[PDB]
């Protein structure tokens, strides 16, 4: 019916106009840090990957939560796959034309993420002390995950991820991924694979067996491009007659998971599940439902139910392929325990049967 769902979207947007003030505060700090990082020998070519102000909001429940990614271009990269995981690689250099300033970040022959991150945190920490025009402090240490957490005016938090940039062709593991031919045409897919790919140092809970010095592929820039150009029609959501509910279904699905995680934060068995699992499942639904008529504004309740049931199927069958790397199973028994998915399945099933009481009125 979406009468309830519409009411949900209306309160989430009222908080995003309040964000614009804090968004400018993020940009000011980010621009300042980039200025210093460029003055460093190793971080000479750093910069923002995508739109700096108002970057990713992993939490939509928390407007104060901010996510930022820094790109560092390194040419002539030799990627060695780690144990056929297909999502994690070792970074090596080729031929050594001459020693690079990045040689201070490598152990043995592989490029160490720990060394690069350590100096990265030190340079940032040095700067926020020299900033008294804007009250900022650094959080420590969040388990060791690459994200550096800063806090502006004691209310908003900003996570800064350092990523490597490669303008070479996408790895072989992404060959059969990004299947958007029926949805966004083979031309667009081909254009997207011409874009550079990115490497991100491993998570806090990696989890083993990981050598601790491997890097994970990142295509968040492609995901954003798809989100802003989601329609089968080139004018989708550019006029009143083509206002689909794709983005809304993604928000509701992300907000559902967050509300569930907040509800069971004492057990910490929904913490493995992140907004990226939801985001991954959503892209698959878009692939299975490429027509814009399958995402009509009037069928918001019906469209959201499809996203829910598909996510349920992914839990039961324990299959959730990475949208770019097919052989990478996000819901594999090695990444998340089976009891966790069954727990999440039961909770979601309860929400579907009782018209999602966790959403509203609140
Ligand atoms: Zn649209």
Ligand 1 mean position, distance from CA 246 (Å): 6
Which among 75, 70, 73 is positioned nearest to 123, based on CA atoms?
A: 70
- How do beta strands 136-138 and 148-152 pair? antiparallel
Q: Are residues 328 and 252 in the same domain?
A: yes
Ligand 1 mean position, distance from CA 192 (Å): 19
Ligand 1 mean position, distance from CA 231 (Å): 5
Q: Taking CA 106 as the corner, what is the angle to CA 102 and CA 108, rounded to the nearest 5 degrees?
A: 140
Whole-number Å distance between alpha carbons of 253 and 248: 9
Instruction: Return the SS3 of 149.
Output: strand
Q: Are residues 8 and 20 in the same domain?
A: no
Q: Are residues 23 and 165 in the same domain?
A: yes
Numbers of helices and strands, H then E, in the chain: 9, 11
Q: Are residues 275 and 318 in the same domain?
A: yes
Q: Are residues 50 and 191 in the same domain?
A: no
Q: Are residues 337 and 350 in the same domain?
A: yes
The structural domain count of the chain equals 2
Annotation-wise, does 159 bind a ligand?
A: yes
Whole-number Å distance between alpha carbons of 26 and 30: 6
What resolution, expressed in A, was reported for this entry? Answer: 2.5
User: Residue 244's domain is classified under what CATH number?
Assistant: 1.10.1410.40
Q: Are residues 157 and 189 in the same domain?
A: no
Token output for 121: 């945190």
Determine the structural domain holding residue 182 and report its residue range. 1-14+170-196+219-362
**C-beta atoms surrounding 91 within 10 Å:** 25
User: Residue 70's domain is classified under what CATH number?
Assistant: 3.30.460.90
Q: Are 69 and 53 in contact (CB under 8 A)?
A: no
Ligand 1 mean position, distance from CA 7 (Å): 20
Q: Are residues 53 and 148 in the same domain?
A: yes
Ligand 1 mean position, distance from CA 250 (Å): 12
Whole-number Å distance between alpha carbons of 24 and 213: 35
248 sits in the region (left: phi over 0; alpha: psi -120 to 50; else beta) called alpha
Per-position b or e across 343-359, b if 16+ CB within 10 A of its CB: bbbebbeebeeeebebb
Whole-number Å distance between alpha carbons of 246 and 229: 11
Token output for 110: 């592989």
Annotation-wise, does 237 bind a ligand?
A: yes
Q: Considering 183, 218, 253, which residue would you say is the last residue of a domain? A: 218
Q: Are residues 27 and 158 in the same domain?
A: yes
Whole-number Å distance between alpha carbons of 96 and 183: 43
Q: Are residues 86 and 212 in the same domain?
A: yes
Sign of the torsion formed by the C-alpha atoms of 316, 317, 318 and 319: negative
Ligand 1 mean position, distance from CA 242 (Å): 6
Annotation-wise, does 169 bind a ligand?
A: no
Whole-number Å distance between alpha carbons of 42 and 304: 46
Q: Are residues 161 and 256 in the same domain?
A: no
Q: Are residues 228 and 263 in the same domain?
A: yes
Q: What is the DSSP string of 280-329?
A: HHHHHHHHH---GGGG-GGGHHHHHHHHHHHHHHHHHTT--B-SS-TT-B
Annotation-wise, does 220 bind a ligand?
A: yes
> How was this entry determined?
X-ray
Annotation-wise, does 66 bind a ligand?
A: yes
List % helix, strand, coil for the chain (3-state, nearest 5). Answer: 45, 15, 40
> What is the chain's length?
362
Ligand 1 mean position, distance from CA 262 (Å): 30
Which residues make Cβ contacts (< 8 Å) with residue 298, sequence separation at least 6? none
Which among 18, 9, 43, 28 is positioned nearest to 121, based on CA atoms?
A: 43
Both ends of the chain: CA-CA distance in Å? Answer: 19
Whole-number Å distance between alpha carbons of 230 and 224: 10
Whole-number Å distance between alpha carbons of 284 and 105: 38
What values do phi and psi take at 106, rounded to 5? -110, 140
The alpha carbons of the chain give a radius of gyration, in whole angstroms, of: 21
Identify the helix (H) or strand (E) that includes residue 247. Answer: helix 246-263
Q: Which residue carries 């509300």 as its tokens?
A: 259
Surface-to-core class of residue 244, CB atoms within 10 Å of its CB (0-12 exposed, 13-18 middle, 19+ buried): buried
Ligand 1 mean position, distance from CA 289 (Å): 13
């Amino acid at each position: 019916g979406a009468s309830k769902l519409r009411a949900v979207l209306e309160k989430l947007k009222l908080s995003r106009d309040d964000i614009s003030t804090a968004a400018g505060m993020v940009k000011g700090v980010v621009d300042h840090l980039l200025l210093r990082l460029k003055c460093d020998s190793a971080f000479r070519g750093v910069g923002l990957l995508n739109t700096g102000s108002y970057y990713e909001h992993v939490k939509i429940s928390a407007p104060n939560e901010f996510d930022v990614m820094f790109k560092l271009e390194v040419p002539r990269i030799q990627l060695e796959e780690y144990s056929n995981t297909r999502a994690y690689y070792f970074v090596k250099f080729k031929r050594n034309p001459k020693e690079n300033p990045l040689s201070q970040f490598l152990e043995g022959e592989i490029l160490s993420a720990s060394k690069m991150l350590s100096k990265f945190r030190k340079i940032i920490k040095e700067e926020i002390n020299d900033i008294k025009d804007t009250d900022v402090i650094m959080k420590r240490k969040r388990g060791g995950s690459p994200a550096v957490t800063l806090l502006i005016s004691e209310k908003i938090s900003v996570d800064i991820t350092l990523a490597l940039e490669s303008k070479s062709s996408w790895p072989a593991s992404t060959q059969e991924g990004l299947r958007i031919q029926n949805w966004l045409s083979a031309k667009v897919r081909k254009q997207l694979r011409l874009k550079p790919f990115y490497l991100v140092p491993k998570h806090a809970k990696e989890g083993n067996g990981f050598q601790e010095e491997t890097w994970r592929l990142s295509f968040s820039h492609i995901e954003k491009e798809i989100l802003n150009n989601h329609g089968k029609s080139k004018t989708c959501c550019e006029n009143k007659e083509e206002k689909c509910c794709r983005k809304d279904c993604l928000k509701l699905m992300k907000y559902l998971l967050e509300q569930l995680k907040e509800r069971f934060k004492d057990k910490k068995h929904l913490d493995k599940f992140s907004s990226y699992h939801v985001k991954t499942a959503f892209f698959h639904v878009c692939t299975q439902n490429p027509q814009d008529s399958q995402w009509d504004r009037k069928d918001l309740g019906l469209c959201f139910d499809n996203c829910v049931t598909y996510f349920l199927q992914c839990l039961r069958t324990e299959k959730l392929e990475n949208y770019f790397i097919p052989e990478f199973n996000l819901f594999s028994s090695n990444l998340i325990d089976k009891r966790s998915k069954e727990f999440l399945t039961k909770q979601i099933e309860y929400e579907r049967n009782n018209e999602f009481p966790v959403f509203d009125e609140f």
